[PDB]
């Protein structure tokens, strides 16, 4: 049912984000500090969130 | 690669995955995701991910 499906999705996305953060920190030798999620909404409804990653360095 | 190349790449993989999961969720519920709120999950070694709460709307 629906609460479960919901939670299920919630977890998979968390998982995905985590993995991509890890791979990116790995590939760049730097640290993701933050991600900005901007809703992508269509007339039929919310479609997705557009994503903006902020990465930190030392200067 | 370039750092910006990578960044943009990851961003698109993420937006895609989210889209995918939303569409499937709607499909599977016959209902509509109105919102997803993200909350940072950080450790002392830095940002680990985001936790995900999904908001779905229902007719009155």
Swiss-Prot record, chain A:
The set of disulfide-linked cysteines is none
Please report a single Pfam family linked to this protein: GnsAB_toxin
A cellular-component GO term for this protein: cytosol
The source's domain of life comes to Bacteria
Report the GO molecular function annotations. Answer: identical protein binding; protein homodimerization activity
Read off the InterPro entries from this record. Gns (IPR012563)
Question: What is the role of the protein in this entry?
Answer: Overexpression increases levels of unsaturated fatty acids and suppresses both the temperature-sensitive fabA6 mutation and cold-sensitive secG null mutation.
* Family under the similarity heading: Belongs to the gns family.
Official protein name in the record = Protein GnsA
Q: Which organism is it from?
A: Escherichia coli (strain K12)
């Amino acid at each position: 049912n629906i609460e479960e499906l919901k939670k299920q999705a919630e977890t998979e996305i968390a998982d995905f984000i985590a993995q991509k953060i890890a791979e990116l920190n790995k590939n760049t030798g730097k640290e993701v500090s933050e991600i900005r999620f901007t809703a992508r909404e269509k007339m039929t409804g919310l479609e997705s969130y557009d994503v903006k990653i902020k990465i930190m360095l030392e200067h």
